[PDB]
């Protein structure tokens, strides 16, 4: 059977980037060219592999990470980047093998007066390691006095909502992102390109 890419790419809602979703894809035929040839994706950037060679490769498993961020932040979903998203939300490794796919989702993910459902981690003390996921919601201590679960001065809830309104400039508009990654072990290959 064909790999269930539609479940990922056509999901009604995407995850918040701080709580980014990972879907394991396995035991199926992947036709990557159908993704790469699509006029839907404004970003389709592979690292450590060329898109036109994917259909010729077999992997143990494939993984699809997905989430929403601002247009201006899509550039952070790449090896070697810094900023609030790369540092505190979703971190690719410096030498990455995989593909980053993104498309404007203003028609789905903005709302008149604002869609506030999509969040990002604004406050964190240190950077994420590659592929780390932090879903904690402890009150963030910004001074020397402990917060003890109470918000206030120097005591901040660590997540913030994007304000996605349809009239936003493109850099402030929501983008849906899928990062494909590939796994090769001393195990049977379960995801190959079409025969």
């Amino acid at each position: 059977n064909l790999c269930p890419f539609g479940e990922v790419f056509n999901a009604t809602r995407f995850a918040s980037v701080y709580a980014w979703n990972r879907k394991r894809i396995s035991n199926c035929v992947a036709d990557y060219s159908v993704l790469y040839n699509s006029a839907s994706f404004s970003t389709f950037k592979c690292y450590g592999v060329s898109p036109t060679k994917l259909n010729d490769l077999c992997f143990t498993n494939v993984y699809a990470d997905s989430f929403v961020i601002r247009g201006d932040e899509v550039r952070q979903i790449a090896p070697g980047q810094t900023g609030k998203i790369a540092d505190y939300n979703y971190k690719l490794p410096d030498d990455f093998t995989g593909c980053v796919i993104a498309w404007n989702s203003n028609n789905l993910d903005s709302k008149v007066g604002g869609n506030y459902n999509y969040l990002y981690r604004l406050f964190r003390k240190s950077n994420l390691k590659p592929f780390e996921r932090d879903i904690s919601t402890e009150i963030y201590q910004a001074g020397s006095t402990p917060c003890n679960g109470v918000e206030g001065f120097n005591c901040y809830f660590p997540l913030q909502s994007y304000g996605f309104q349809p009239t936003n400039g493109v850099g402030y508009q929501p983008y849906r992102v899928v990062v494909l990654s590939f796994e090769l072990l001393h195990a049977p290959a379960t995801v190959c390109g079409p025969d």
Partner: single-chain antibody
Framework: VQLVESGGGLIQPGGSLRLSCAAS????????MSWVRQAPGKGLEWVSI???????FYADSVKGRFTVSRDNSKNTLYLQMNSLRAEDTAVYYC???????????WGQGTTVTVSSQLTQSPSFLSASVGDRVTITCRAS??????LAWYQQKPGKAPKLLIY???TLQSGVPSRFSGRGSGTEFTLTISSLQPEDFATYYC??????????FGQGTKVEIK
């Protein structure tokens, strides 16, 4: 809570300075910390930022020449300023940067003298005590509610009034209000008081490039 800048002075072009910002009541290493400067008679210009996790970013006007850094054991922020130019002349402010919630803590500034988009309307306004005063800030694209307002009294550091376009900063008098979403934003002072004669700045939050300020509206007597 205070930020105390030092290290400024009078120098010729080509020289170097190091600014220090000693913090108390906020922890430099746990915060976004920015440097913002203001040339004499001009508006605010964001210079650099350092993240809690260590990332640094710079205005194009200073890239390659300035370096922001910190010493956690001294709770101190630094700005190393090399290859200084006449146009780097300004007061340099240390600020604690809350991003979506504006720049809420400002130092008093240190003066550097080197010597051999958001549009506010009007640029100048004359008013009387008790007047209702409104100032408008217009963005070049839709920015939702990503706007802050600041007041800067003559000789003083700016003070945060409003963030998220309409949220009153804690401790700020209720006669200040902000409205707007999208491209057009207004600050209203419901009954102007003698202490309210100042210059007001809007700021586009989480902007690209970072730290976009309007050019300021000066509210003056009569």
């Amino acid at each position: 809570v205070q930020l105390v800048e030092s290290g400024g002075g009078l120098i010729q072009p080509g020289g170097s300075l190091r600014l220090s910002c000693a913090a108390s009541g906020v922890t430099v290493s746990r915060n976004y910390m920015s440097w913002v400067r203001q040339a004499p008679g001009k508006g605010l210009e964001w210079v650099s930022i350092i993240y809690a996790g260590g990332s640094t970013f710079y205005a194009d006007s200073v890239k390659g020449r300035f370096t922001v850094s910190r010493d956690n054991s001294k709770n101190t922020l630094y700005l190393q300023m090399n290859s200084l130019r006449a146009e780097d002349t300004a007061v340099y402010y240390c600020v604690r940067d809350l991003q979506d919630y504006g720049m809420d803590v400002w130092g008093q500034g240190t003066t550097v003298t080197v010597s051999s988009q958001l549009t506010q309307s009007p640029s100048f306004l004359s008013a009387s005590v008790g007047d209702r005063v409104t100032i408008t800030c217009r963005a070049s694209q839709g920015i939702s509610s990503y706007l802050a307002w600041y007041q800067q009294k003559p000789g003083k550091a700016p003070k945060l009034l409003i963030y998220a376009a309409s949220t009153l900063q804690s401790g700020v008098p209720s006669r200040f209000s902000g409205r707007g979403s999208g491209t057009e934003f207004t600050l209203t002072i419901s009954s102007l008081q003698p202490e309210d004669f100042a210059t007001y700045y809007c700021q586009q939050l989480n902007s690209y490039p970072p730290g976009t300020f309007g050019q300021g509206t000066k509210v003056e007597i009569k």
